[PDB]
């Protein structure tokens, strides 16, 4: 059973401006989505610190960036705290609504795309690289879901019936054509190395087969 979602309209005009923006600094969704899952470990790992039962669905608190070139994906996977049902279909679309009017601003005052995590809406960034965002995740309180995104104005979230994570949150990137550079393991080194090198949980690059 798919349920199908209409963005608010703020979010998707950000979406349209992400995609259809000429900008050449790619790179730094990888530093918003890796931003993303250390926030999400940061809570979990406080949240346990008062409840050390939140761990029993996984003690290991790290970040993980799977490419696959023969399904032109890149995973950025963590052992986060998770998102609810809530949280996939309005909690975070309503944190983002002033965060992205907030944005819109900055950019027309001088800003560039690249300062978008300042304002809270960095994971809108993925698709300045991805044509097809995947997020499956699963939160202590709630069932494993899927949601996905191509953009064009909607969104859809199912339970996920795949291999159960445990806890946490992973981001599938279905790459654009032209952006497969982001699969080569010298490319993501280089851009964790610039970017990402102070995250206070281990992050660990897999490499293809
Ligand atoms: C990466 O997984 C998560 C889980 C929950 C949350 C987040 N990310 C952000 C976007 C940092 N805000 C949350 O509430
Ligand atoms: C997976 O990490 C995130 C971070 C922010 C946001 C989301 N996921 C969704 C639920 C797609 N909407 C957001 O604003």
């Known amino acids: 059973e798919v ?3 209409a963005f608010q309209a703020e979010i998707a005009q950000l979406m349209s401006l992400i995609i259809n923006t000429f900008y050449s600094n790619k790179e730094i969704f990888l530093r918003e989505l890796i931003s993303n899952s250390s926030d999400a470990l940061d809570k979990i790992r406080y949240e346990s ?6 761990l029993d669905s996984g003690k290991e608190l790290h970040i993980n960036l799977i490419p696959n070139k023969q399904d032109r994906t890149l995973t950025i996977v963590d052992t986060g705290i998770g998102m609810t ?3 996939l279909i309005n909690n975070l679309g309503t944190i983002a609504k002033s965060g992205t009017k ?3 601003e900055a950019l027309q005052a001088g800003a560039d795309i ?3 995590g300042q304002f809270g809406v960095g994971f809108y ?3 300045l690289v991805a044509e097809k965002v995947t997020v499956i995740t699963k939160h202590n309180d ?4 899927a949601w996905e995104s191509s953009a064009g104005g909607s969104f859809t979230v199912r339970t996920d019936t795949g291999e159960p994570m445990g806890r946490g ?3 599938i990137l279905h790459l654009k054509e032209d952006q497969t550079e982001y699969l080569e393991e010298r490319r993501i080194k280089e851009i964790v190395k610039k970017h990402s090198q102070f995250i206070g949980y281990p992050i660990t690059l897999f490499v293809e087969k």
Not at 142 to 145: P, T
């Open 3 to 5: 349920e199908t979602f």
């Open 49 to 54: 610190l008062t409840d050390p039962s939140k």
């Open 85 to 87: 049902k809530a949280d």
């Open 102 to 104: 907030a944005f819109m």
């Open 114 to 116: 690249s300062m978008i």
């Open 125 to 127: 960034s993925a698709y």
């Open 142 to 145: 709630d069932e494993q879901y």
């Open 169 to 171: 949150t992973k981001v």
